[PDB]
Amino acid sequence: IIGGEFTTIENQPWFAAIYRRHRGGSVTYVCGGSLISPCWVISATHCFIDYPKKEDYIVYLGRSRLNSNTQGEMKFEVENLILHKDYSADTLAHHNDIALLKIRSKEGRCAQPSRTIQTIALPSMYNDPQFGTSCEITGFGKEQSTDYLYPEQLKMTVVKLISHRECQQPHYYGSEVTTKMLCAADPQWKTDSCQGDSGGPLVCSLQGRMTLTGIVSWGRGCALKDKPGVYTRVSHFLPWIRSHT
Numbered sequence: 748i749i750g751g752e753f754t755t756i757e758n759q760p761w762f763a764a765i766y767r768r769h770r771g772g773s774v775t776y777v778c779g780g781s782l783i784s785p786c787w788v789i790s791a792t793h794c795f796i797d798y799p800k801k802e803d804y805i806v807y808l809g810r811s812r813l814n815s816n817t818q819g820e821m822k823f824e825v826e827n828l829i830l831h832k833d834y835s836a837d838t839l840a841h842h843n844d845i846a847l848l849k850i851r852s853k854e855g856r857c858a859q860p861s862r863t864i865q866t867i868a869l870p871s872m873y874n875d876p877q878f879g880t881s882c883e884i885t886g887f888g889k890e891q892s893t894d895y896l897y898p899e900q901l902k903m904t905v906v907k908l909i910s911h912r913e914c915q916q917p918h919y920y921g922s923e924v925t926t927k928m929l930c931a932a933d934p935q936w937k938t939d940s941c942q943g944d945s946g947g948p949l950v951c952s953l954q955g956r957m958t959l960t961g962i963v964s965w966g967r968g969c970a971l972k973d974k975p976g977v978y979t980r981v982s983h984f985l986p987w988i989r990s991h992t
């Protein structure tokens with residue numbers, strides 16, 4: 748997250764921290780995700796595509812720091828890693844960039860809700876807030892494009908929804924962005940998602956309810972003028988999510 752503020756898991760309790768075990772036993776951060784029901788975490792397919800094997804992954808819920816065990820966290824293995832069969836990657840843009848992780852603990856149980864662990868509601872069909880609505884994004888991604896390290900503390904910020912029309916303009920993304928994608932950005936381009944934020948939540952208030960409107964997918968750089976963050980448009984994937992959960 749470029750700009751924004753540090754936070755703790757209490758403020759974004761559906762946020763899931765996804766890690767991979769390497770050949771040798773070293774464990775590294777991969778991507779964010781979101782808890783959409785006790786047994787199911789939703790994330791982005793591009794995060795896993797180089798390593799499709801579900802035994803390689805560990806998911807934490809209730810975790811506020813990248814490399815320390817937050818008090819109250821839960822740890823899960825991945826019992827079902829569902830990548831979207833229509834996924835594709837161009838030079839920049841990712842299509843159908845959505846993934847589902849079925850989680851189960853070593854004790855064979857799903858998520859138990861707490862002050863640090865909650866689900867996030869899905870939108871209803873094709874129901875998005877209007878452009879200019881403020882939404883929040885959360886993650887452990889880079890704080891500056893040129894950073895090598897990820898921040899050790901969880902971060903969040905606020906971006907505003909941009910219209911498909913505006914995001915289609917030539918100095919934005921042209922035809923790289925489609926109707927199953929949503930654009931969001933800061934008016935001053937001062938805060939954004941970045942590398943390491945992929946798979947994480949874009950959450951908006953809709954009908955006075957917090958709703959998983961987007962999943963961090965891609966962008967050209969981070970916090971660049973005329974280059975919004977691009978998100979998987981969750982309200983356009985509900986059939987796929989229903990059929991797979």
Ligand SMILES: COc1ncc(-c2nc(C(=O)NC(=N)N)c(N)nc2N)cn1
Nearest residue numbers: 940941942945964965966968969970976
């Ligand atoms: C040109 O170098 C470069 N490296 C990484 C990224 C990148 N960006 C976003 C991203 O959300 N960008 C954004 N919201 N502007 C992302 N999720 N993952 C990424 N790897 C972009 N550019």
